[PDB]
Design a protein around this nucleic acid. Structure first.
Ligand SMILES: [K+]
Length: 86
DNA sequence: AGATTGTTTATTGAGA
DNA sequence: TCTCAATAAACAATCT
């Protein structure tokens, strides 16, 4: 049987920012961001289709998130995302 | 191909 | 009314 959780009081900027700040390298992949968010806020275990679309939109749309490429000799899926140094 | 990641554009909704 | 946040969606790049 399923259970209603209430949306926590954070914008996607805030959610992403917190995820990154917490990370030991100060950077996370997109899927790591998803993980951190879901692990912590069970509200986000539903409707993953739309809220993840929002996250992706946020990373690209907002200048405060910076794409870090993976090393040539350490390849993988997607880039890391860190905070713009502003 | 098939899915994930990323970008971009347009709309919509909420709150001041 | 107007800005900004969130949503929806089209389409490309890049992984599996
Ligand atoms: K960006």
């Amino acid at each position: 049987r399923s259970y209603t959780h209430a949306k926590p009081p954070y914008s996607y900027i805030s959610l992403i920012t917190m995820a990154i700040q917490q990370s030991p390298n100060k950077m996370l992949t997109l899927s790591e961001i998803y993980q951190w968010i879901m692990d912590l806020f069970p509200f986000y275990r539903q409707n993953q289709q739309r809220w993840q679309n929002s996250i992706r939109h946020s990373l690209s749309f907002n200048d405060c998130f910076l794409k870090v490429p993976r090393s040539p000799d350490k390849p993988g899926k997607g880039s890391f995302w860190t905070l713009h140094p502003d």
